[PDB]
Design a binder for this molecule. Structure first.
Ligand SMILES: CC(C)CN(C[C@@H](O)[C@H](Cc1ccccc1)NC(=O)O[C@H]1CCOC1)S(=O)(=O)c1ccc(N)cc1
Lengths: 99, 99
């Protein structure tokens, strides 16, 4: 699709057999989801945003779908105020910025 | 242009007669630049990011150019780890996300 930017680029994603809303975020290297459960082993990671450093759990090889586009990727979980789809997945599904 | 996302979508902007690099950030409602001096008067504002709330200065009607595209808009200045161009300007210059 083409996603315009006068409103937040919120889309529907699928993870862990559930549908959620997430922000398509070109300014995030990595994908971060608000607190939830994911299966198996996770490493702790540090990310930096505005406001400073946040400790999150990194899950590898997580099946996920973003507007009908399927992928398996790394997904960080922790205290973010918004589900965020970052460049690791945006590139995978072929997303570009155009003007 | 078309800007791909396997690397950070960093572009050249012009503001206050200087060229700087900035992140095209679909996940930022607003444009925030690292500390700099800008003409005239400013209101304080609070923004939220992944690590919490940050106090910034809001300058209105700032002439700016983003990758060859000229505009006048709101620009916030504050302690951000990166120059970021948010949806206020991205929409103006006709940015979309496409996949
Ligand atoms: C600070 C930039 C460079 C990186 N952030 C992405 C930005 O798009 C960030 C996304 C966000 C949306 C909603 C709530 C909180 C954060 N928006 C942001 O700060 O909104 C400010 C900027 C102006 O208006 C408000 S990030 O969240 O810290 C980030 C960093 C690393 C990873 N792996 C994931 C996310």
């Amino acid at each position: 699709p083409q996603i315009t930017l006068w409103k937040r680029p919120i889309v529907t994603i699928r993870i862990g057999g559930q549908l959620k809303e997430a922000l398509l975020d070109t300014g995030a290297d990595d994908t971060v989801l608000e607190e939830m459960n994911l299966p198996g082993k996770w490493k702790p990671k540090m990310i930096v945003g505005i406001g400073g450093f946040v400790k999150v759990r990194q899950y590898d090889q997580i099946p996920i779908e973003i507007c009908g586009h399927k992928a398996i990727g790394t997904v960080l979980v922790g205290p973010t105020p918004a589900n965020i789809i970052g460049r690791n997945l945006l590139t995978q599904i072929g997303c570009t910025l155009n003007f």
